[PDB]
Design a protein around this ligand. Sequence first.
Ligand SMILES: C[As](C)(=O)[O-]
Ligand SMILES: [Mg+2]
Ligand SMILES: [Mg+2]
Ligand SMILES: [Mg+2]
Ligand SMILES: [Mg+2]
Ligand SMILES: [Mg+2]
Ligand SMILES: [Mg+2]
Ligand SMILES: [Zn+2]
Ligand SMILES: [Zn+2]
Ligand SMILES: [Zn+2]
Ligand SMILES: [Zn+2]
Lengths: 340, 342
Amino acid sequence: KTPKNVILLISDGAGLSQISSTFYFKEGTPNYTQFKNIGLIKTSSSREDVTDSASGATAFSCGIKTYNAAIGVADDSTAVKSIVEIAALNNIKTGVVATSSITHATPASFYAHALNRGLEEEIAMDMTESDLDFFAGGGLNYFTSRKDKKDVLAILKGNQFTINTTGLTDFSSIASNRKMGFLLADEAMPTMESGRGNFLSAATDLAIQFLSKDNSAFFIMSEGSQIDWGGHANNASYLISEINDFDDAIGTALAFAKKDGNTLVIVTSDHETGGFTLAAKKNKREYSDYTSIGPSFSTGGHSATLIPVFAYGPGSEEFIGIYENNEIFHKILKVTKWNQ
Amino acid sequence: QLKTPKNVILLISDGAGLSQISSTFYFKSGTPNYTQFKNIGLIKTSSSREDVTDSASGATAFSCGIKTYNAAIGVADDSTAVKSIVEIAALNSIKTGVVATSSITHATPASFYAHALNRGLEEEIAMDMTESDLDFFAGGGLNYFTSRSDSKDVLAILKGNQFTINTTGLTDFSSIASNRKMGFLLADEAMPTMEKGRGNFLSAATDLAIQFLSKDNSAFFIMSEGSQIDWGGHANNASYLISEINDFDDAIGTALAFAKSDGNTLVIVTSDHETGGFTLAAKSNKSEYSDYTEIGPTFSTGGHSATLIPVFAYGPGSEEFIGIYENNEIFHKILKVTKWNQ
Ligand SMILES: C[As](C)(=O)[O-]
Ligand SMILES: [Mg+2]
Ligand SMILES: [Mg+2]
Ligand SMILES: [Mg+2]
Ligand SMILES: [Mg+2]
Ligand SMILES: [Mg+2]
Ligand SMILES: [Mg+2]
Ligand SMILES: [Zn+2]
Ligand SMILES: [Zn+2]
Ligand SMILES: [Zn+2]
Ligand SMILES: [Zn+2]
């Protein structure tokens, strides 16, 4: 009932309908079918019925409701301790993986504290002050082509990071590093449609092997970042290709957890985007053909639907039922007994 | 090794996806009864021939435990009749009831007492009621029993089978307690909408079924349907959809209040499919920008969609309903937990 390790996978912008696309548009059975314990979260922020990713992720990373655009700060704008900082005090190794820039609102709410999510140069500099042990994502520009002219990589190397800006490597290439960071694009990683391939699964496997090196317990947040961008663009093949990749990472996590026996895997989203619907195909006589799906959208923004939570591993029963998003944080602390 | 329920209440919200359910968290006074549920599953709703299901195949999945074609009522993909949960209940000495806010002959209620090649055959469906072992029903659809193209009087046949029938109003329990079976036909076609003054019919009817079917310490099975959530969806009419699902949520609280007091009753809440691509979008301010402080509901289709659908279960055996499975497994899971003879 007490997990040693926690992997949190966040599919940005995926409601149940986006999840459902994997049951129609992906070869084979989705890894979602492996879960038995399922819950539901209410995703409103402290001030807005519709959340953004910043307050959405800060509800998970810090266990409070805060205003849209906040990174790691409470509604009154004061810094709050995150699960990464708490994990560091409990001797837990930590890693953050994302297919957006590593400074984007979701990863950022795990290692920075900023008044507004668009302060991405401040966020990059904030990593220099975090106990983060591993990261992988885009966003090389935020560390090396800055308004202030500073070389943030040099500071990170001073803090014991090895940084790779060229490719994800084998685990044998990084096993002896103390901390490891990958910055593999200037801004966001490529889309799956532009050849990103299995970055998310590979990077999440690297984080697991790296952070568990010396029998240390770990916490990892891996984010399927571009699902939401698909929803905002009302671009169905973009959305579906990104969520199928995210379902591959879920299989990666779960294959490790099932063998390990001491790992809790939580999958959820921050909010839904686009009103994405698996509607019947539309024909011109305009009528429906229920034999076939034609994905449609109703909005270019986020929506307030409750969002599914999936949990596998010791303590996974704590995540069933219907609760506010910020209680994800408290439920993790409860089952791991990591102290605050 | 789960607990075994004596009784089962299956509540269907037709047309309600997770976004429809979520509307009760923003548009209902107080806290939704959905929040009482701990055990939660997901069903895949495709029919035997269609990725996007209709109510008939999707309800027949629940009542008979098979995938079948859109429009089938209690019949298999080859059009042969299949034994239903209500027919199994009767053979196990279980009292049965069906409630709906549509006509009682409409596809969801029909799939639990009738066997017909096509949901359009509502006069045959009303006739099938006379050969079923149903003990209790309430809904609309008086026209299918007394104003038929074949000028037969079906009501007379139902009374011939030990039904008492009321076409006036729902009564209290002591009003109907001595009757061996009870039917309420309270509208010619569909019951009124919530916006046109239906009021608390669905909870009252469900409560009444529960008292009636549990006379003399009898085990029971009830299907009650929030039928018009779907029609709000089809019309792309937010206040209609939302008032109808708020009323369904009230029905959930009625079922759950009984189950908690009883302690021997499994309550299952699900839907057959989603409809309308209903979305709790950010309100538009005016030339148009999104204001995330508040919600303005939007739709993307006039028809059903293929999203996976949430299942909620509470009571003995409810742990059977977690995880992800085909819609037709609802039937098999009900059978498995109740330990009824098949
Ligand atoms: C516009 As349509 C045929 O999806 O209701
Ligand atoms: Mg994000
Ligand atoms: Mg800062
Ligand atoms: Mg495309
Ligand atoms: Mg119906
Ligand atoms: Mg028949
Ligand atoms: Mg209206
Ligand atoms: Zn987001
Ligand atoms: Zn977004
Ligand atoms: Zn339906
Ligand atoms: Zn419909």
